[PDB]
Design a protein around this ligand. Structure first.
Ligand SMILES: [Ca+2]
Ligand SMILES: [Ca+2]
Ligand SMILES: [Ca+2]
Ligand SMILES: [Ca+2]
Ligand SMILES: [Ca+2]
Ligand SMILES: [Ca+2]
Ligand SMILES: [Ca+2]
Ligand SMILES: [Ca+2]
Ligand SMILES: [Ca+2]
Lengths: 152, 152, 152
């Protein structure tokens, strides 16, 4: 029993070391292209791509396109967009049913921050969504190129 | 004994929370300049350099130039090459014995994906190896500049 | 007991795996924009900004502008500057009292590596500090754009 006790004490020190070391690396890793908010992490690729390409990049990386589900998440995402000074694509589209935006899973939106008058399906061909540097949303043509930002 | 149990129960909760956090941060880390395959991790510096300089960058970083040892590893590396649209240097050279490519350790290749007609030692001076966006290999002069991709 | 001893072995296995995985990840993260020295880590954003903007970026990331406090730290920082071939801003300034450089906290410098003749407050308007590829320091106008390097 004393042997196991010694083992536990050792593990406690090793875990404490990992926690401290990892806490430091979290900050290092997110600088300058990442943003943590709650349990979610947004990270930009630093370049622009059309929706389909951006979506694939995020999915293959084990995440998905930025999908802010609260004002707080949206504000965090906005910080990255502002820092890079490039509007970015969100994950939602109304490709299936015009006028009804959904997440990649098909679920309807639980949050939105549409600019006044949006979505307006301008030209009758805007089924993707972009977030501006001011944090507001606008439906935009999926064929256009916007900043690639994924969430993990 | 009873106190040790709860101590173990607690410590493991912390470790599993650490495992989850670490796993999330690893995915974030690899986007968009890295690729994991098995226990190996490829990461590109995002710029080009001549072989000697590229090799030094990887060694100083605690790794080595990309050394795909299987079709799976080659495919993973190919993803970075395609993403950057820049052919990359591999670690192998036939500088010691012309025609015989080896890893930095001196060991002979256990896998190769030479493009048709390669390695041809063009000009009688191609002792380094580059991987194209199509995943195939070609021997090339070490003085040329290619994408820097290290493996860890 | 025999069950506790079993749980401990599993826990030990999880911690040992994390130590190996974390160590590998650290190397990946630092390549190619980071440098570890002592308990400090320098990381460059890979781009240039005026002092105020560079300072805010580091602060918002949970760190601060590079603040070498020893020859060892300065040498580590110098590596990033050399690697990017771009002089970088340090955190210190004499904005409060001309001729007296201080850290962000307000404390006086505990180490300096001024190039010959510096600081010279050229034009009567140099209150910020930059580090050259040779590791030496020079006071520079805060409005100029230099490589952003933060410390964590
Ligand atoms: Ca439509
Ligand atoms: Ca639409
Ligand atoms: Ca619109
Ligand atoms: Ca030769
Ligand atoms: Ca040759
Ligand atoms: Ca050839
Ligand atoms: Ca002054
Ligand atoms: Ca001054
Ligand atoms: Ca000066």
């Amino acid at each position: 029993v004393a042997s196991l006790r010694q083992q536990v004490e050792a593990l406690q020190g090793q875990v404490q070391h990992l926690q401290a070391a990892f806490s430091q690396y979290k900050k290092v890793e997110l600088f300058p292209n990442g943003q943590s908010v709650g349990e979610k992490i947004f990270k930009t690729a630093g370049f622009v791509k059309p929706f389909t390409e951006a979506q694939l990049l995020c999915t293959q990386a084990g995440g998905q396109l930025a999908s802010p589900r609260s004002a707080a998440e949206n504000a965090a995402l906005q910080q990255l967009v502002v820092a890079k000074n490039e509007a970015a694509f969100l994950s939602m589209t109304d490709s299936k049913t015009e006028g009804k935006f959904t997440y990649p899973t098909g679920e309807s939106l639980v949050y939105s921050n549409w600019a006044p008058g949006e979505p307006n399906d301008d030209g009758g061909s805007e089924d993707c969504v972009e977030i501006f540097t001011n944090g507001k949303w606008n439906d935009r043509a999926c064929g256009e190129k916007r900043l690639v930002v994924c969430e993990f």
